[PDB]
Every structure is written in structure tokens, then in C-alpha cells.
Write a protein that binds this DNA or RNA. Structure first.
Ligand SMILES: [Mg+2]
Ligand SMILES: [Mg+2]
Ligand SMILES: [Mg+2]
Ligand SMILES: [Mg+2]
Ligand SMILES: [Mg+2]
Ligand SMILES: [Mg+2]
Ligand SMILES: [Mg+2]
Ligand SMILES: [Mg+2]
Ligand SMILES: [Mg+2]
Ligand SMILES: [Mg+2]
Ligand SMILES: [Mg+2]
Ligand SMILES: [Mg+2]
Ligand SMILES: [Mg+2]
Ligand SMILES: [Mg+2]
Ligand SMILES: [Mg+2]
Ligand SMILES: [Mg+2]
Ligand SMILES: [Mg+2]
Ligand SMILES: [Mg+2]
Ligand SMILES: [Mg+2]
Ligand SMILES: [Mg+2]
Ligand SMILES: [Mg+2]
Ligand SMILES: [Mg+2]
Ligand SMILES: [Mg+2]
Ligand SMILES: [Mg+2]
Ligand SMILES: [Mg+2]
Ligand SMILES: [Mg+2]
Ligand SMILES: [Mg+2]
Lengths: 169, 292, 159, 205, 58
RNA sequence: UCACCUUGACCUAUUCUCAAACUUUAAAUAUGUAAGAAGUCCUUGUUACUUAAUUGAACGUGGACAUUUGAAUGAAGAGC
RNA sequence: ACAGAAAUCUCCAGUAGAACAAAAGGGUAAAAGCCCCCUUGAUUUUGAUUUUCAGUGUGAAUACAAACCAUGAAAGUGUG
RNA sequence: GGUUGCGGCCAUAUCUACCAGAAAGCACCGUUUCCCGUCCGAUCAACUGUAGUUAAGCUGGUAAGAGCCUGACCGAGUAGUGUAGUGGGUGACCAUACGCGAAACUCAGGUGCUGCAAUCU
């Protein structure tokens, strides 16, 4: 149709929720760092339930956002770990998709004090050129209805390049 | 989806340009409100706007029925002064600010007095008032919505308008060369930014590193065979031309306004009438409930 | 006990007038007030500084002083059996000009103009206003207007 | 152990509702406001009979129960309980207070009453045209439980709707009428034609 | 013992016995609360005008 | 059933009825100001305030306008 | 992924249905909310004004003036 | 007439859905040495109008569209209400006289106008 109506990856966020503070979540920040190439940022707890063992403002999670070419190959590693089997679910109505894995840091390895593993959440945000209009300071517009990402368009793009299959066992 | 009728009835719109995202009315109140005991004195702002591919500097006062432009200078009229490429760079913002300073001081009769910094060195300077003469033209900077950051081209325009002899109140911690340790501006980086040195050093290091980037970027420089080490005298001759003739020649206007108007009317969809709306509704009723 | 604070009984007076909340438009800040101008007082509820007391809502007075963001207003207030002059220090968003002093000044200009065309010729032009007068003699035609009306109506319930 | 209704007969106070300031109001004993065949079609019950107040007073919720049960039972006995539709058209929203000797004499909530005007319907019944005498006799029996004067007006409207009987027939033998579960929906000249085709097929002929 | 707290009865008839007075305006009101910088310059602008009309007539 | 008369809700379009401490709307009565000589225009004097700049501001000089001089009715004298 | 109605992360909607120390009302959306940076204008002098009112006091508030400062690129704002 | 920058009045301008937009502009878009800013050059900053595009933004139109605005001898001189009576009625309340006068409703119409500057087949 139009090269400016093409569907891209813009960011990929790697969330590890470790409902506590200390050495475990410090190493969970570490295991995000050498994969992303980027220092991650921790997230405080919003409130306190006293059932999850979390208190308010406790830094109980880490996450990092990776963009451009670096996001694409981490997504490729995640799909090789998931064996290219996403579900009928995992795809948002807004055209974003994610999953969860653990222990895929087998290559690209640092000094590696292997005491304790972490699982990890992949989430991929998908858009088109012109998404600056909803993020820029001046003339903050809304992406048009034709230009929005949808679940059908993102699953068509996903069962294109990476040539995977969804919903299948 | 599904905005309710109660929501639509109770909704209050923002003005028009808050909706358009062009006017911080919070900032505009503070920039436009005159001292009430200075009764009808217009408060003048140097509006500096950076679109892609143009720099706009306008000296504007405000009235009840709308704003009034005193003088305007654009970066696309700097090719008359000898700047063809890089028309939104930091130095181009400087040349546009110098041009609006000289044009306004020629329009107001303050061109003999208030020459400004005639030889640009890059030092922090304010236009001093001439004793037993007119005070200099006091202009207040309107950066609009864009962020105040160290090295931004709004302060290039500020620096050029101050060097052209306008009184613009400004500190110096937002020019390139400022450092957060010592409260001192660096005139070396400030003067290199004024004379385009940050562009020129990039052309030098791309020409010594890799050429597929130096042919994508700066292609028009190579087509107009401009050297990296020769931007400084282009900018200097441009400043001399600005200080020698800033008087705003306009363009040719080239197929005049009625011929513009009649040709551009042939692409306006015209609003329909009640007769075509009733006929449209009746034909739609026939097409939709006429039993196929 | 009882309560007589500064903004007591101002639930509706300083309210902000449906779908006109938020920022004040800028002609309010660009109107120019001279000493001697006759101004109306209506407090904006969204600006809490320079705000008049609730007594002065709907009161009309004379500018005696002009300051950085505010004007002083003379208001006559009926304290007991006499009138006291009150001096108010009101910011200009609680202030608007009186349209009566517009209308009277165009009547002054009209009076001067018709006195000039009376001096040109035709003196005694009779340039005061008059109250509404009893109407003169009409002739009412019956041309396509034959007077045809029925009677009072019977009672029906229509419930 | 209850005050007679002549104490709280007249609208002497501002309406005192159950609010965030009242908080301790006893329940209205009238809880059923539609009776008979309430689910019936608008076409089922064309004739509307109204019991209408002639006075500005208050009707207690006790009196509303006592008249609703009497009119319902007479109409059920004589004509069957699915041949009429009864609607109490007033709701006891005003809290009556009792002070149970004048220092601090503000009252605690006694009960609930309904403030009626001259010309408000208290009870409306829709039936077939052949049930008119039974309905008028049921409403005139229900008069005795209410203080004040009340008239029985035959409505010139089809059913509980707000348009005349020839106007409703002109509207339904044309195509501006479609059924709801107990009421009806009317077709307008305003709105999107796609929705006015999505409902109301039988028009546009 | 308990008595009559407050009433405004008869107070308007008392205020109209001497018939509520307007405060008798004058040419040249006072500079009470007029801006001090304007007052300071008004002093000198009237000093110079006194001298100007002194030299105009003598 | 391991997609079924006998589903809690929730949403959608309707429906009956209300509020001293609810409200988009909103009277009547009551209430503020004005309806000029201390007014209006024309010209130019002051200043340390104000303006980029006699630009304004405020107060002025000199001049033009005579009771229909700026709605009504009354005024019992008015003011102190 | 653990992870469910509640932990984190992403998108969309969202006119305020949140928040603003404490009652209730008013006000507020590139904010008066939230988060960050810099600070002490919560300073000095002594008048004026508003509300309570006798046009006394006290409390509280408004707008200026003379300084000295803070903040910001600035207009400006800041006498809790 | 289009478009831009700065506006004024702040929905006749908003919202939902669809369809068009020549020229210029605006825009998306391209790059990260430099000033600067982030977990992330996404936002902010810088550089080039070059590699590309009208897909979106933006503008305009359409809709028995929602909302909003205007008007109506539409409802309605209705409700309410000032004044009056040794009016009526046990009362609740009501009528008359001299005046003022709504809202919902129902119809019809409309769907931004405009100031300064600059630019454009
Ligand atoms: Mg704002
Ligand atoms: Mg700002
Ligand atoms: Mg109070
Ligand atoms: Mg209040
Ligand atoms: Mg109000
Ligand atoms: Mg305060
Ligand atoms: Mg007894
Ligand atoms: Mg009582
Ligand atoms: Mg009875
Ligand atoms: Mg005693
Ligand atoms: Mg006593
Ligand atoms: Mg009394
Ligand atoms: Mg007396
Ligand atoms: Mg007295
Ligand atoms: Mg009351
Ligand atoms: Mg209301
Ligand atoms: Mg008079
Ligand atoms: Mg001035
Ligand atoms: Mg506290
Ligand atoms: Mg006192
Ligand atoms: Mg005293
Ligand atoms: Mg106190
Ligand atoms: Mg204070
Ligand atoms: Mg100050
Ligand atoms: Mg304080
Ligand atoms: Mg304060
Ligand atoms: Mg980019």
C-alpha cells in the first residue's frame, strides 16, 4: 500500500518482578544489564497488601526498555526459546504482544556468579511511522484510525517475518 | 469509543490553540500582561519558532483584537545574505536574530545609536543604554513550548538579537560552552557555535572517518563546493550583509493573489445545502428501504 | 455556633459559571483602566488574590488608583443611616468596565454633533431624551384582515 | 403508638429527604408500585383511568399501601389479576419527624410521606375498555384510604403513554411505533438513518 | 430570663428619619491609597506648573 | 452438555417518581451605577513617574459650546 | 513466567469522576495535582485598604511604596 | 482561496465514523560528532533537507449523526410572582383585578468567524 504505512517494533520492555529488595533483585537488575546493554530501572510498589509480602515504595521490580536493532535480536532469542508458539492470546487488541521465559542468557556471557535464576517478561510495542504525533510537545495529535496498530495487522506481520505460527500446539 | 451525550454536553473545550497545542496560555498571561500603570505601552516579545526547514523570528505586541507584528525575519530569506544550507542550524538562528535586531532598529530609528556587538567574539553582553539618548528597544524572548536546554537555538536567536543592539533580558547559562561546575560561559565554544564550527568539525571528522555518510549528509555543500573550513567567512560575510542591508525586500509574488485564489478554490469541497441534504436523505431512504 | 468568615455564604457567587472554568482569557488582562473610569465588580472564583468581599459583587465604582496588577475602586456602602466611601484593592480579573459609561459617552458625542448641525442652521433642535409617549391616531385597514375571532373555550380535562 | 395522619396531613415543611444528613430513616412500607399484568403490551391496555388529587397535602406510605391493596384486590376479584395494570405514581420521599419539653425539641424520623399537588395522579390503571366500571369502582374504593378529595378522570391517552388515542393509532397503523417489554418506543425524524433502519423496519414504504 | 435576641424591625424607619445621606463629593479628592511613586512625581509636576504659570503671567 | 425453560450482575435504549444542606436553566419582587459645566472637543505647558521614543499618565494654560446644559415627577429651602 | 480480584510492565480510553495536611464549600489539567532542580519573600521599614465594625481594638486578608533577596533564559512570581 | 507563525472571541470550533487534499507550507521522515537529555537519540537536544512519503498529523467535506449555538405568537401568557379586596372556601387552597413573566418541551435554521505578518498555480 504505502511505505509510510509499515509496521515496526519500537520498543521491547523486559520486566522481572522480584517482590522484595536486596541481593536477589540486585542480581535481577544485573541479568537485565548484560543482555540489554543498558542499565535498567527499578520500580517501587504502589501500595501494601500484606499477602504478597510487599510494602509500599520498596523497589520490588526491575525493567528496561530496548529499541531499534537491539530489541529485534532479543525478540529473536525469545522466540527461539518459545519455539515460535505464541497463542490466540498474547496479542493485545491495540496490536502489542508479549510473553515470558527464563534462562536464555547462555550466550553473551560475563563473569557470571551463577547463584539463583530469574524469569522474565517480554513485551513488544508495535507502531507505524508517525507515532511522534502522540508523543511530541507541540501539536500533540492522535494517530488516525487507519494508521493504528490492530491485533489482526500485528498477527499478520508476526506470521510474516520470523515466519512463526500462532495458536498452535 | 462511545462518548456519551452527557459527556459531550458537559465537556468544556480548551481554547483553540491549546487544543492545537501551540499556545501555553499560562506562559502567555505572564508574557503579555503589562503593568497596569504603564497604561497603553505595548509589551514586545521576540517570538522564535523552529519548524523543520525554517526559523521564524517575529517582534510582536498584543492587542484586544489580536497580535501585531512589528518586524519579521525568516531563515529562508538569509540566502539573500549568503546562507544557502543549514537554514535551521544554531548559527542560522543567530543570523535570523541579528537580522530581526537590525530590521527592528532600522524601523524604529535606533540604527545609528545601538549598533550592538559589531565584532562578534562570543562574550556575555547586554545592550547598555546610551546616556542622554533613547533607551534601547526592550524585547522579551518567547520560546513558546520548546524546552529550555543548554545549547538550544532559541538562545542562538537570543544571542544574535542581543548582539544586533536589542535589549533582551537574559542570563548566560543556556548558551553552548556553559559548564555546571564553574559559573562561567566559554567564549571558544560560544564563538564556534556562532560561526558554525560545530557543523564544520563534523564535516571534517566525517571526511576523515567515512564518506557514505558525508555524501548523504552535506551533499549540497559538496555540490556548491563549500569547504568545511570555510563556513566561518560565509557566516561573517552574511553578518556584514545583514548589518549593511536588513530592510526586508519581499518576494516577487509571482502569479498574484486573485490568480492564487481562483486556482486554490478548485480544490475546496463546497458545503452542501438543505435541498441537497433533503434529496440525499430521500434517495438514501429509497436505496435502503425500497425493498432492495 | 455562628460563622461569619470572609467568604461565608459564597457557595454560588464565586462559582465558575458552567463550561467556563479554567484559565482567564487575555483581553481581561489587556484592558486598560484609567483613574476615574467606572468599573463593575464581579469576582473570579479561580483567582484568589486581589479578591473583593462578597458585599461588592454587582457593585459599580470609580477607579482612584492604578498599580502593578490591580486598581483601587471607590464604592459607596450604606452603613446604618449614611453612606461611607470604601477603597478597594482589586486585581483586574475581578474588574470590568461599565457599558453604561460607553452608552452615555456616545450620547454626549451625539449631543455635540446635533448641536453642531443646529449651529449650522435651525437652532432649538430639542436634544434631551423623552420618555415613551402615548401613541398617535392610526387608521387600521380591514384589507385581508376582516376581524374574525371566536369565544372563550369550554373546559376539557385533557388528562 | 402511631400519631394520626392529621398531624402530618399538610405540607408544612421544606421536603426533608433521606440524605447524608438524615441517615436514620425508617423504611417506606409501600414497596410495590406496579401491580397486575405489568408486562403487558401497550396495545393490550388502551384505556387509562386516573385517581387524581384535588388538594395540596401529604399521603403517608401507610395510606399508599392501604389504598393499593384495596384497589388491587377489588380489581383482582372482579376482573382477574391479569386484566389490569396498576401504577402508584407517588413515592413517599419526605421524612416526617416526631419529637418524643421544648428545649432541644428537634424531631427524630417518624415515617415517610408523599407530597402531592392539585392535579397529580396518585394511581393510574390501564385496562381494556370493557373493564372501565371495575377500575373506576376499585379506584373509588381506594379513595377511602386517602385523606382529602380525589377525582376519577378518564384519560384521553392510550394506556400509560403521553399521546392521544387517535394520535397513537395514526402513529401505529403508520410505522413510528415498536414494542418494548412493558412500554413502547417511537420513531423520530432525527438521528442516523442506519440506526432508524436497524430499528423500525416497517416504516419507509 | 429569655428575651428577644435580634430584630431589624424599625431600623429602616429610623435610618430614614434623617434620610440616608450621600457622602457629599468634592472636586480634588484625597490621595489616600494613591500610589506613592505617582504622588512623588505629581508633587514635582505641580511645582513646575506653578512656576510655569508664574512666568507666563508675572 | 463434561453447548441445554429454570442466568447474579454489568452495559444499552426506555419508563414511574423526587431533593434545605442537588443542578444545565431560571423569573417576579428587592438591589449597584449612569443620565454632563468638576461636561465635551481643539491646541500645547509641568515632572525626579512612565515610554524605544513628550510615548503615556496626572494636573494645567488659552480657546469653542448659554439652560432643551443633555430622561420624568417633586423639592416641603439646601448644606453644615 | 511465577502472578490469581489485588505485586510489576505495555497500550488504549479517560473534563477530572483524582489530588491539593486537617471540616465543608469554592477553585485548579502543558495546573494550584504528581515528580525533580534551586532556594528561604515564613526577611526589613512604616503607612494605606478590606472583613468583623463603633467604621474602635484584635485576628485574618488585599494592594502598593522603600530596601535586600530567591527563582527562571525571561516575562514575571514570591511579604508563608 | 490554500498554508505557516503569532493571536482575539473560546465547541457554530467539540466528539464518532468515512472520504478527498493540486501548489506552497506544515508534517512524518533521515543521522548522532557536537551542546544537552534519557533505563531507551521514543521524548528532549544537535546536524542534514539530504535518503523518502502524503500513510498519519493537519485542512476540508459528508452524516434524516451525538453535542453545541441561534430563533419561534412551539409549549405559554402556562408555572411562578409584585400589588388589592370586610373576594370564595371549615380548611387545604383557589378565583378575579392591576402588572411582570419562566424552564423543560416542540419545531425550524446553523456547524467557527476574524486581526497582524509572511508565503503559494
Ligand atoms: Mg494553560
Ligand atoms: Mg514556561
Ligand atoms: Mg459560613
Ligand atoms: Mg464557598
Ligand atoms: Mg453565578
Ligand atoms: Mg495566600
Ligand atoms: Mg387519640
Ligand atoms: Mg416547620
Ligand atoms: Mg379521600
Ligand atoms: Mg438565671
Ligand atoms: Mg432585650
Ligand atoms: Mg423584621
Ligand atoms: Mg425613629
Ligand atoms: Mg439610624
Ligand atoms: Mg430556603
Ligand atoms: Mg439550579
Ligand atoms: Mg435622576
Ligand atoms: Mg503611562
Ligand atoms: Mg497535616
Ligand atoms: Mg473594628
Ligand atoms: Mg468608637
Ligand atoms: Mg477570627
Ligand atoms: Mg497571606
Ligand atoms: Mg514585590
Ligand atoms: Mg500566613
Ligand atoms: Mg502569601
Ligand atoms: Mg529520530
Amino acid at each position: 500500500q504505502n511505505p509510510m504505512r509499515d509496521l515496526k517494533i519500537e520498543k521491547l520492555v523486559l520486566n522481572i518482578s522480584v517482590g522484595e529488595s536486596g541481593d536477589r533483585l540486585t542480581r535481577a537488575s544485573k541479568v537485565l544489564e548484560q543482555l540489554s546493554g543498558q542499565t535498567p530501572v527499578q520500580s517501587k510498589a504502589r501500595y501494601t497488601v500484606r499477602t504478597f509480602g510487599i510494602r509500599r515504595n520498596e523497589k520490588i521490580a526491575v525493567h528496561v526498555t530496548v529499541r531499534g536493532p537491539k530489541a529485534e535480536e532479543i525478540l529473536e532469542r525469545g522466540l527461539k526459546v518459545k519455539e515460535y508458539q505464541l497463542r490466540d492470546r498474547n496479542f493485545s487488541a491495540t496490536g502489542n504482544f508479549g510473553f515470558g521465559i527464563d534462562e536464555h542468557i547462555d550466550l553473551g556471557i560475563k563473569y557470571d556468579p551463577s547463584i539463583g535464576i530469574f524469569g522474565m517478561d517480554f513485551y513488544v510495542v508495535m507502531n507505524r511511522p508517525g507515532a511522534r504525533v502522540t508523543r511530541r510537545k507541540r501539536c500533540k495529535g492522535t494517530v488516525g484510525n487507519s494508521h493504528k496498530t490492530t491485533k489482526e495487522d500485528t498477527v499478520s506481520w508476526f506470521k510474516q517475518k520470523y515466519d512463526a505460527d500462532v495458536l498452535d500446539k | 469509543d462511545a462518548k456519551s451525550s452527557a459527556y459531550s454536553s458537559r465537556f468544556q473545550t480548551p481554547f483553540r490553540r491549546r487544543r492545537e497545542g501551540k499556545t501555553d496560555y499560562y506562559q502567555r498571561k505572564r508574557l503579555v500582561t503589562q503593568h497596569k500603570a504603564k497604561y497603553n505601552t505595548p509589551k514586545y516579545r521576540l517570538v522564535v519558532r523552529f519548524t523543520n526547514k525554517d526559523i521564524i523570528c517575529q517582534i510582536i505586541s498584543s492587542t484586544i483584537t489580536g497580535d501585531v507584528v512589528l518586524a519579521a525575519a525568516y531563515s529562508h530569506e538569509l540566502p539573500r545574505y549568503g546562507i544557502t544550507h543549514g537554514l535551521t542550524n544554531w548559527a542560522a538562528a543567530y543570523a535570523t536574530g541579528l537580522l530581526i535586531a537590525r530590521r527592528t532598529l532600522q524601523k524604529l530609528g535606533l540604527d545609528e545609536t545601538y549598533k550592538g556587538v559589531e565584532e562578534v567574539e562570543g562574550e556575555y553582553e547586554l545592550t547598555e543604554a546610551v546616556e542622554d539618548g533613547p533607551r534601547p528597544f526592550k524585547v522579551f524572548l518567547d520560546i513558546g513550548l520548546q524546552r529550555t536546554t543548554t545549547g538550544a537555538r532559541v538562545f542562538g536567536a537570543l544571542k544574535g538579537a542581543s548582539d544586533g543592539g536589542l535589549y533582551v533580558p537574559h542570563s548566560e547559562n543556556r548558551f553552548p560552552g556553559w559548564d555546571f561546575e564553574t559559573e562561567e560561559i566559554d567564549p571558544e565554544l560560544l564563538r564556534s557555535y556562532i560561526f558554525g564550527g560545530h557543523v564544520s568539525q563534523y564535516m571534517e571528522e566525517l571526511a576523515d572517518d567515512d564518506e557514505e555518510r558525508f555524501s548523504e549528509l552535506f551533499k549540497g555543500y559538496l555540490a556548491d563546493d563549500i569547504d568545511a573550513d570555510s563556513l566561518e567567512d560565509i557566516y561573517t560575510s552574511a553578518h556584514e550583509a545583514i548589518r549593511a542591508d536588513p530592510a526586508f525586500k519581499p518576494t516577487e509574488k509571482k502569479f498574484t493573489k486573485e490568480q492564487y485564489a481562483a486556482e486554490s478554490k478548485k480544490y475546496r469541497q463546497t458545503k452542501l445545502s438543505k435541498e441537497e441534504r433533503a434529496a440525499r436523505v430521500a434517495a438514501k431512504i429509497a436505496a435502503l428501504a425500497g425493498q432492495q | 455556633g455562628k460563622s461569619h468568615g470572609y467568604r461565608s455564604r459564597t457557595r454560588y457567587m464565586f462559582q465558575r459559571d458552567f463550561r467556563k472554568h479554567g484559565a482567564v482569557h487575555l483581553s481581561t488582562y489587556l484592558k486598560v483602566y484609567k483613574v476615574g473610569d467606572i468599573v463593575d465588580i464581579k469576582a473570579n472564583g479561580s483567582i484568589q488574590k486581589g479578591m473583593p468581599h462578597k458585599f461588592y459583587q454587582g457593585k459599580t465604582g470609580v477607579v482612584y488608583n492604578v498599580t502593578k496588577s490591580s486598581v483601587g475602586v471607590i464604592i459607596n456602602k450604606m452603613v446604618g443611616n449614611r453612606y461611607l466611601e470604601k477603597r478597594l484593592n482589586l486585581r483586574v480579573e475581578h474588574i470590568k468596565h461599565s457599558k453604561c459609561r460607553q452608552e452615555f459617552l456616545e450620547r454626549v458625542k451625539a449631543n455635540a454633533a446635533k448641536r453642531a448641525e443646529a449651529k449650522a442652521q435651525g437652532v432649538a433642535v430639542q436634544l434631551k431624551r423623552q420618555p415613551a409617549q402615548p401613541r398617535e391616531s392610526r387608521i387600521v385597514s380591514t384589507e385581508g384582515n376582516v376581524p374574525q375571532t371566536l369565544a372563550p373555550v369550554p373546559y376539557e380535562t385533557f388528562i | 403508638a402511631r400519631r394520626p395522619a392529621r398531624c402530618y396531613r399538610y405540607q408544612k415543611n421544606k421536603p426533608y429527604p433521606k440524605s447524608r444528613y438524615n441517615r436514620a430513616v425508617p423504611d417506606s412500607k409501600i414497596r410495590i408500585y406496579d401491580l397486575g399484568k405489568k408486562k403487558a403490551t401497550v396495545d393490550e391496555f388502551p384505556l387509562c383511568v386516573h385517581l387524581v388529587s384535588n388538594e395540596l397535602e401529604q399521603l403517608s406510605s401507610e395510606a399508599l399501601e392501604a389504598a393499593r391493596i384495596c384497589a388491587n384486590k377489588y380489581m383482582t376479584t372482579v376482573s382477574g389479576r391479569d386484566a389490569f395494570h396498576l401504577r402508584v405514581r407517588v413515592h413517599p420521599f419526605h421524612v416526617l419527624r416526631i419529637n418524643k419539653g421544648m428545649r432541644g425539641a428537634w424531631g427524630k424520623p417518624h415515617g415517610l410521606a408523599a407530597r402531592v399537588d392539585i392535579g397529580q395522579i396518585i394511581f393510574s390503571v390501564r385496562t381494556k375498555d370493557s373493564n372501565k366500571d371495575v377500575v373506576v369502582e376499585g379506584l373509588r374504593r381506594a379513595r377511602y384510604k386517602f385523606p382529602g378529595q380525589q377525582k376519577i378522570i378518564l384519560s384521553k391517552k392510550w394506556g400509560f403513554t403521553n399521546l392521544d388515542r387517535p394520535e397513537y393509532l395514526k402513529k401505529r397503523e403508520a410505522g413510528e411505533v415498536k414494542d418494548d417489554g412493558a412500554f413502547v418506543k417511537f420513531l423520530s425524524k432525527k438521528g442516523s438513518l442506519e440506526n432508524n433502519i436497524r430499528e423500525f423496519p416497517e416504516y419507509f414504504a | 430570663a429569655k428575651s428577644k435576641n435580634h430584630t431589624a424591625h424599625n431600623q429602616t424607619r429610623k435610618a430614614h428619619r434623617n434620610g440616608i445621606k450621600k457622602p457629599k463629593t468634592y472636586k480634588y479628592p484625597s490621595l489616600k491609597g494613591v500610589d506613592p511613586k505617582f504622588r512623588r512625581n505629581h508633587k514635582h509636576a505641580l511645582h513646575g506648573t506653578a512656576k510655569a504659570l508664574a512666568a507666563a503671567k508675572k
